[PDB]
Automatic annotation (TrEMBL), chains A, B, C:
The chain holds residues 247 to 516 of 775 of the full protein. It comes from Rotavirus A. A motif (DGE motif) lies at residues 61-63. This is Outer capsid protein VP5*. Disulfide bonds join 71-133. The lineage of its organism: Viruses, Riboviria, Orthornavirae, Duplornaviricota, Resentoviricetes. Residues 1-232 are annotated as: Spike body and stalk (antigen domain). It is found in: Virion. Residues 237-270 form a coiled coil.
Amino acid sequence: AQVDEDIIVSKTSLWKEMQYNRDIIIRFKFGNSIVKMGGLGYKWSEISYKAANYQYNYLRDGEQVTAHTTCSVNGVNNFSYNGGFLPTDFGISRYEVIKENSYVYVDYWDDSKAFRNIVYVRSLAANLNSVRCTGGSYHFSLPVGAWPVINGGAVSLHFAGVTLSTQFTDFVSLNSLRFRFSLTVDEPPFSILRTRTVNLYGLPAANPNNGNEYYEISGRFSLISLVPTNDDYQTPIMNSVTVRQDLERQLTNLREEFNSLSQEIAMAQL
Amino acid sequence: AQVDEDIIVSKTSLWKEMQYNRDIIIRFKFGNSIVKMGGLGYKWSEISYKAANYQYNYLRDGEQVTAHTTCSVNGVNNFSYNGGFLPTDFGISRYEVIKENSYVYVDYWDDSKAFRNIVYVRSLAANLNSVRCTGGSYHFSLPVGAWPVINGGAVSLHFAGVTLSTQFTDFVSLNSLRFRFSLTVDEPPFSILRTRTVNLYGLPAANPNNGNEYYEISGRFSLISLVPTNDDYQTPIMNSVTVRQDLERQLTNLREEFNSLSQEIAMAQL
Amino acid sequence: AQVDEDIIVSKTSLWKEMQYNRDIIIRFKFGNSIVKMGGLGYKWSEISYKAANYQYNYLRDGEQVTAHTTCSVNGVNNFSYNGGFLPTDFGISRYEVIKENSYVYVDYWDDSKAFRNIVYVRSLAANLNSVRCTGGSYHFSLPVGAWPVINGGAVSLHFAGVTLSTQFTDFVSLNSLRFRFSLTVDEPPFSILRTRTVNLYGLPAANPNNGNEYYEISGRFSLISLVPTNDDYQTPIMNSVTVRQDLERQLTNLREEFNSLSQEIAMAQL
């Protein structure tokens, strides 16, 4: 049996049931979303995770395969560092952290033949190997005073269930394989400089990438999917999104209000 | 014939053709987006409707069923109550109302076999007993003055066509059943207390839920759908979305610009 | 054979392959994102293209067919024009211009039979005559002074490859054909008045319509696709979208605190 074996489980006039057994490498990238509150600038409203996409290409047994990965997080805890109510003290209203109770979803899609018309899937199984994700240092750059840095944090992604999924983006709409990863916090705690809380585990959402362009996981899967008989097909994967038009409308309404207010401020000042 | 029968009508080596009839409970919930204008704080910019999602689960004949619902609206009426031209008095630029000319859409999906690979459907029909929706009270919190309250309003949803559709949320993508609802006004007319606009029918977006956890419609549907021959297949249903990076970037640029403006304001103050 | 030919190239008990050959007219409208920076009002933040929808209907040979089109671009070139570093003079940080290197994607869908269940497609070929898109004139609204105006720009869109795609909107998710258009810049350059730069070719994002309601491209395509034999089968066309709830949350937080700051500013002014 080959590492990249292909088998026709069943065939008919218009359809077939191809079994694909591929060895893959999953290169994903955590997505952080940092927003700083107004005022003096010592208060950070949210430090939250975000579904992040990474598009790469790697080397199969002699083949160049373009892959698209999308990492999101499920059930992250909402912690918060608070020092005082005045605008003088550093504060984070809320920041998301990955913990034992949470899960990490990674959706992978490949240019290979195993994904060309993937809609239906038998017996989806895969073996992956765990990985260490260590959080980096992020500097809360204040205009005066110190620069409290959040540091530490480390988790171990351990493989768990696999299902189908979809990868929607402005550019593509892929039918992908989703692997969930349970978690086990590693040893190094995580803490902030000039902060009361210490000796805590997890992975803060500040810079979970921690310098690395990606976290690499080697794995392989085994699926059987209906694809119609011949191969010269283009199921729609490339996309075109014009979604949340009401959201866009209210966003531009807020922007024009902000521009008018700022112009009024400038006119008053000058 | 059973309430939840699973009937065949044509079978082939790869594909079959199931007739599904199910008794369902459609629990949905209205959505609203209150956007209050800037200025002195007496003006509201829009009181609109939103396509609101609602997960739940209810007991079938001895077994749980998890359901996903999405209530949206079409053809709303844009009323506008203007207290006066001054920036000191209560005012609303626009608010959406539900009247006869409009429609209410409710998309529905379950974790049962009837939706396992629902991608093609014919002979679709259903019977849904009507329902009534009465709008609750919403207090417009002005900086000074007795709070005006929009209340009243009640509209009865009567059944109309049933068609296929798709529910898209941040986490999932569901091939769902859409139910159309025509509307009839009812006795209590919506209006604002301590206000001039009176005796006008419909339902306003201020609080269509009226403290109800949901609006429940008992119902059943019938459909016939191609699905693969054996039920061990899974079309992708669970989703990851990163669309509108344009809106993401625009909002982030606005955030940083506003942060600079607010920092300048506070620094000038101090 | 006729202009609107329909064939059955291979039939089976449940599925069949139909070769559809039909004419089309692709009326598509460009999209723009005019964004205003804060400050005195002498600065523009970005003038970029946007994925724009357009729904219409036109008379086929005796029939009246409704159509949906979605225009978008990629690889657009960012040009920056600054009068001077001071904040009193007119300046534009970035505007996006389409040149020979970039492309235009036009996605197209109809009510007609060709798109009833279009998922899998063979041998998709088409013929589209070229079009000429000439930009209009957009007046930049300076606070006080001689309003600078960007005018000109013109590109000939020539046909290129054609593939499948999916148009996502707040109402309908359409399974569509994407036509790729290469570009060749035409004679009349694009220029801003009260300016130093001259005779640079392209099409700026300020106003790619010239007041035109659309750009009409006569067309005819051809494709073979699986559909179920029973023509009563319907794939879900209609849609109900609620993606990117994080954007709603962030925008709402921004608007609430912005209202707070506006209250502070207005009260201080009073």
